[PDB]
C-alpha cells in the first residue's frame, strides 16, 4: 500500500529476500508462502532461488574463500557487508548479475550463521541487506518494474524470453 513514495517496493523486496535467505539457510529446498508478496513474491522467490543457487554454486569456491575470510559474527559487521554490496556498483553499472550476487552472498552468509545457530544475527543481516541494497538502487529498481523485470531477465533462457 502506497503511504510515502515507494513503500511497496521495500515490502515486496524484503519479504522475498527474507524468505529466500532464511529458506536457503535451512539447507533444504523449501519454499514458504509470502504474506504480501503473492504474485511478485512467488515469481521472484522461485527465480531468486534458481538464480541464487546457480550463482553461488558456480562460484562456490570463491564464496567459501570469502566466507572463511569474513569475520562476520555480530551486528557491527553489517556496516562492511552493506558497504561491500554497494561497492559492487561503484562504477555506476547496476547489472542484475551483480545485484543477485549480493543476494547469493547474503544467503551464503545466512547459511554460515545458521550452521552455528546464530539466527539472531541472520534477521538483522537480511534486513540490512535488503535495506541497503534497495536504498542505493531505488530509482533503478522502481524503473525496472522491480522484481517483475528481475525475473524476466533471468527467464530469457527458455521460459518467458523472446
Amino acid at each position: 500500500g502506497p503511504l510515502g513514495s515507494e513503500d511497496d517496493l521495500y515490502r515486496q523486496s524484503l519479504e522475498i529476500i527474507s524468505r529466500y535467505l532464511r529458506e536457503q539457510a535451512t539447507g533444504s529446498k523449501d519454499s514458504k508462502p509470502l504474506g504480501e508478496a503473492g504474485a511478485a513474491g512467488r515469481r521472484a522467490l522461485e527465480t531468486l532461488r534458481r538464480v541464487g543457487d546457480g550463482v553461488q554454486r558456480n562460484h562456490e569456491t570463491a564464496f567459501q574463500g570469502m566466507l572463511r575470510k569474513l569475520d562476520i559474527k555480530n551486528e557491527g559487521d553489517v556496516k562492511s557487508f552493506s558497504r561491500v554490496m554497494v561497492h559492487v556498483f561503484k562504477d555506476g553499472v547496476t547489472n542484475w548479475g551483480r545485484i543477485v550476487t549480493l543476494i547469493s552472498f547474503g544467503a551464503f552468509v545466512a547459511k554460515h550463521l545458521k550452521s552455528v545457530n546464530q539466527e539472531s544475527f541472520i534477521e538483522p543481516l537480511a534486513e540490512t541487506i535488503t535495506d541497503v541494497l534497495v536504498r542505493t538502487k531505488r530509482d533503478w529498481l522502481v524503473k525496472q518494474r522491480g522484481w517483475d523485470g528481475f525475473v524476466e531477465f533471468f527467464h530469457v533462457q527458455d521460459l518467458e524470453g523472446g
Binding site: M66, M85, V88, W96, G97, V100, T101, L102, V156, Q157
Partner: peptide, 27 residues
C-alpha cells in the same frame, strides 16, 4: 579480525561474469 576489501572486488567480478552468463542464452 579485519575486513580486507577483496570481497567487494571478488563479488564485483563474479557479478559481471554471472550477468554475462545469464544474459547470454544457450544459443
Amino acid at each position: 579480525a579485519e575486513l580486507p576489501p577483496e570481497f567487494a572486488a571478488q563479488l564485483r567480478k563474479i557479478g559481471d561474469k554471472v550477468y554475462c552468463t545469464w544474459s547470454a542464452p544457450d544459443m
